[PDB]
């Protein structure tokens, strides 16, 4: 979504993020994700990948590379080498 292209815009969507979820808005927004307003469902502004069921210790960048490795925002921020590693390529 076009209005979620900035980190600050994505941070504003976490207004009603449930406080019990063990991952923080700053981590999520940095990795491209904004809150869609249901449970702990987030989506990437670039690739539209959705992630939910966040667990203690999850790193949103690693999860983004695990499930949505072709995302261009992810590749530009973290690099193809990182994404390849998370996909089991060295």
């Amino acid at each position: 979504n076009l209005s979620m292209q900035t980190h600050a815009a994505r941070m504003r969507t976490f207004m009603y993020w449930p406080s019990s979820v063990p991952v923080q808005p700053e981590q999520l927004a940095s990795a491209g994700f904004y809150y869609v307003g249901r449970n702990d469902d987030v989506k990437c502004f670039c690739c539209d990948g959705g992630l939910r069921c966040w667990e203690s210790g999850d790193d949103p960048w690693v999860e983004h590379a695990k499930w949505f490795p072709r995302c261009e925002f992810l590749i530009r921020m973290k690099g193809q080498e990182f994404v390849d590693e998370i996909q089991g390529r060295y």
């Binding site: 469902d41 990948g49 959705g50 939910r52 999850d58 949103p60 999860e63």
Partner: peptide
């Protein structure tokens, strides 16, 4: 996390 899990994808959708």
């Amino acid at each position: 996390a899990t994808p959708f």
